[PDB]
């Protein structure tokens, strides 16, 4: 029913017309997203792993093996805020209408989602955990490398993935770490490893994590399943906040300090097949 026309809708589910644009901007900005492969689900999904030994009308008693089951859930919510405080009251958005608001909000909400998602999803730090994660899988299987940036260490890092019959695909290095990567050249084969123009380390694309949970680190991915469900779903807000902070020390009292916020609850799920490597600085 609604399209352009007006904008006086406080509560409301976003239409799939607008859900694909907002998620399109989230896809490029998020680092884990770019690397992963997203199969569709609802509230939950049950996935099974492994193969089996199978002969043709003979069979000797060997190769029984293990089969593993797994299910996934838990959400990833984030706030818009920015648009709301810049553009106040509904009558002001009545001129903008439904179509105008989403396009103008597009980069702010999309920037928000990935920052929180990666801060808890890759490094297990941000307060929205769900067990399955990159940093958590490394605690199970030790793939640790010492703090030196030479070709042989990156070869040894990839070799640790090869030990458990697995191929390297992509890389994750911090923006600050980009300086040290470029100044690594072998004496015999005089060629630069990390190419500046085509962002890749060993002919494999590096993706720059903007989160401040790294220093001199490299993460590696390949077979990885992120999932998404439903809608972003918006609610207009003229009420008190606990989560946010108003500059000095007091909170975001929306009707106290005359603002007009927005709430956007997106539903995103994660699954990990395990065996992922990581280099970290040792120093002393």
């Amino acid at each position: 029913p609604d399209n352009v026309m007006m904008h006086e809708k406080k509560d409301g589910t976003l239409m799939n017309e607008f859900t694909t644009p907002i998620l399109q901007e989230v896809m490029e900005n998020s680092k884990i997203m770019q690397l992963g492969k997203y199969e569709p689900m609802e509230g939950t999904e049950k996935k099974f792993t492994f193969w089996a030994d199978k002969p043709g009308a003979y069979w000797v008693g060997e190769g029984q093996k293990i089969e593993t089951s797994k299910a996934t859930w838990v959400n990833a919510t984030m706030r818009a805020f920015k648009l709301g405080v810049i553009l106040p009251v509904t009558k002001e958005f009545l001129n903008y209408t439904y179509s105008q608001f989403f396009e103008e909000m597009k980069p702010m909400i999309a920037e928000a989602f990935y920052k929180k998602f990666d801060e808890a999803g890759i490094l297990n730090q941000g307060n929205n955990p769900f067990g399955k994660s990159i940093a958590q899988s490394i605690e199970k299987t030790n793939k640790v490398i010492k703090g030196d940036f030479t070709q042989d260490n990156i070869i040894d890092l990839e070799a640790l993935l090869e030990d458990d019959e697995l191929e390297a695909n992509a890389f994750i290095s911090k923006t600050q770490n980009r300086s040290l990567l470029r100044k690594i050249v072998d004496p015999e084969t005089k060629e630069r490893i990390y190419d500046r123009n085509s962002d890749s380390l060993d002919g494999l694309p590096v993706v720059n994590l903007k989160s401040s949970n790294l220093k001199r680190g490299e993460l590696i991915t390949g077979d990885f399943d992120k999932l998404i469900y439903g809608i972003p779903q918006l609610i207009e807000y003229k009420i008190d906040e606990t989560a946010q902070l108003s500059t000095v020390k007091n909170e975001d009292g929306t009707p106290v300090n005359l603002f007009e916020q927005d709430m956007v609850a997106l539903r995103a799920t994660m699954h990990v097949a395990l065996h992922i490597a990581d280099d970290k600085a040792f120093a002393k």
């Binding site: 694909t20 896809m27 690397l35 492969k37 997203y38 569709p40 992509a170 694309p205 993706v207 998404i228």
Partner: peptide, 16 residues
């Protein structure tokens, strides 16, 4: 949902 997965493969870093 299915359109998002189609867009994902197009807008991936490594298309496969």
């Amino acid at each position: 949902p299915q359109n998002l997965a189609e867009i994902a493969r197009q807008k991936r870093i490594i298309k496969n």
